Subunit: 162 residues, 6 copies
């Protein structure tokens, strides 16, 4: 059983406030991160139809500065479905309502595991793309996943050492 990438796609529009920025009037990367995780977890929950935990934040690329009073659009979707886990891709776009432009300011990939009521890993549906963008993320997912798996081994060695 399969769900589309659109089915669980979640949106979030926010305006960037003074309490969201640093001393440079530039948005705190940590605030951006917290929003990213919030939206992504909702997307993962919707796709799995279950509670989720964040296993890892695989990367956040901060591509463009985000200023006070900028309007952000966050798009989260499942880009990959393993057995009990999913990759969620979050796009952060600066949304300019004055010239109707949308610039890509941040890109993030996270990994969530679905759980049952007892906290055991839960099977999830597979996922499929419908448009060219979803397809891009879906098609590039398999290399990211194999990297995540290799990086898990490095973290394991690190933990074993400490």
């Amino acid at each position: 059983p399969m769900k589309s990438m659109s089915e669980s796609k979640c949106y979030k529009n926010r305006q960037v406030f003074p309490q969201d920025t640093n001393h440079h009037h530039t948005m705190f990367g940590g605030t951006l991160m917290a929003n990213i995780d919030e939206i992504a977890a909702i997307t993962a929950m919707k796709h799995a139809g279950a509670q989720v935990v964040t296993a890892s934040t695989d990367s956040v690329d901060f591509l463009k500065p985000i200023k006070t009073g900028d309007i952000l659009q966050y798009v989260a979707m499942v880009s990959y479905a393993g057995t009990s886990s999913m990759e969620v891709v979050v796009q952060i776009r600066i949304d300019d309502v004055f010239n109707n432009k949308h610039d890509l300011a941040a890109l993030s990939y996270l990994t969530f595991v679905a759980l049952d009521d007892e906290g055991k890993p839960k099977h999830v549906p597979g996922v499929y793309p419908e448009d060219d963008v979803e397809k891009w993320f879906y098609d590039t997912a398999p290399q990211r996943v194999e990297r995540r798996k290799a990086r898990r081994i490095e973290s394991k060695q690190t933990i074993e050492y400490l």
Copy 2:
């Protein structure tokens, strides 16, 4: 010059945290109201393509209790365009991911005014609906706007009286 109710339609998915509730495990009306104004302001900004100020909160109807760990979907859209003002309707739905339900937990109507860079009221485009929901809010708007107009008078008597 006109826009659809869709072009400016904004979404927001948020789960309900402790810091968002009262001691009863139920969501504080204040937090809910703050989310409403934020989302609606973004919508009016998209529609007017201009800065906005909230002129009034026409109403907030709390129709169902909202609990910690509930998943919220806010939908904001412009339901009416006057000269320089917009009515924005916000629907707050309880989104159940375990049984794929959606319930209407609250309903809010706001009025925003568009402004130029000098803080003067700006002309806005008109609005039109495309589906039966958009059309229900679009069709029922004219009475609400007049009731809003009447109530501005009542506020005036009151300011004068004090």
Copy 3:
């Protein structure tokens, strides 16, 4: 059993901080509304001697800009007591400490329902005014309250339609 409007009258002085503003050094409507609901709920709790829930924000009129560094005075009173329900009026004034001026910057009306421990609507005492202002809010409340009940139906039609 009856209480004066003064018996439950509550006050709140607060300064307006950067975290309460948007990009234009102007107070966020949503923040003002959260403060309004908080103060109103305390007043209704005092009047009912019971836990309360906010059934509706009947209106918030934003009349004057509220700026960073402004001192706000909120006054909350019960202007109407139905069987289980209270209308609360909240006045928000900008308090100028340099020329002892007070300006009405916002006006709000909210509806609370008092509950027993098990969550069932509880009977509240009646209310009465003692001065000219209190009398004004009191005398105008029944028309607002009849509008509130009528609006409830519109909301019901909307829920039914959706």
Copy 4:
């Protein structure tokens, strides 16, 4: 020039929210202190008719545990006025709306200095009490003051040694 203690007296009712507490459902002392400073600054601003800075927090005595859902009443008053400095006393009471009790749960004393537009210490009016409580705080100030002054010296020695 002189003012009563009552002319600058400030009130604040707030409910204690989950976000204000620690793991034991108990109000974070830090929160309480932030509220103290806020209400005290407003009071001192009123008295001095100027911008103010917190010179010192002379004490905060935590006397009764404050719990989630509690209603707090803060009362701030100038209990002493030197040349450019004001002592503000804040009383924090737990306000029980179920039985009309008010227990003193905290007491605090702070020192503010009034500043002119350029940042120099600004003269403030004298202060005088009108009721027995006001007289109590007013008459006991001289010992808190000489305790403040001796302690400024100790701070100086500490800075010097470091």
Copy 5:
């Protein structure tokens, strides 16, 4: 049984954001004080090996204005250990990463009580200094402690009187 002042010494580095300041770009004393309590309570729990409550804040001396984007270093240590109580001294330094200077911007003394699982005062180990700074606060605490005991009674009289 004993512990050095170092064993429980806690550090906290934070940058000063817009949300932490008032309208003068300058750190809200309240924010400063919330951070103080947070770090000091951690040190006290570490030293006691138990839950703690804040009994009082004995003083906060605001020595230097702290501006937006400044880097703060908080250091908390136990400077005195009664039977069940601890004086904790918190030092607040402005950390300049450009010229590797540190300025003392605030100094604070708090008093905590250790509690057993049942909420009763719990005996704590004594404390000893190892360096010249630790010795300075250690050697000076007894005079502060006696000032604190005296001041608790004062606070008692105030409660009785009111």
Copy 6:
């Protein structure tokens, strides 16, 4: 010109409050990420002697659930110094004050760029280790850095495609 890993090592002790958790009494990963980014940026600033921007979050591995009332220790250090960039490793430990344990709950790597006052990349000193843990992170840095640079390209393609 070179700095030890210890020279810029920054600590943060924090306790996990109700407002930091989700409905399962478990710390929000978003909150943990904000904290991570803050401490790491300070470490970056210390090492670089300059302002910094967060270029990317390379990973966050969530290894153990973190619960309310837990005490956290964050440790941030520069593990790699490129020309204008730094890798910062943040360790998050659950600190048990009752049995003196420290458990590794999360590990993160982030990448910062040093800027001059005009926003151009700035040269940073090199870094070197002094103890076995520092040496472990330093010695594993080269492989992560090369992975960072391969992944940046993927992101370039993705940006191009979109």
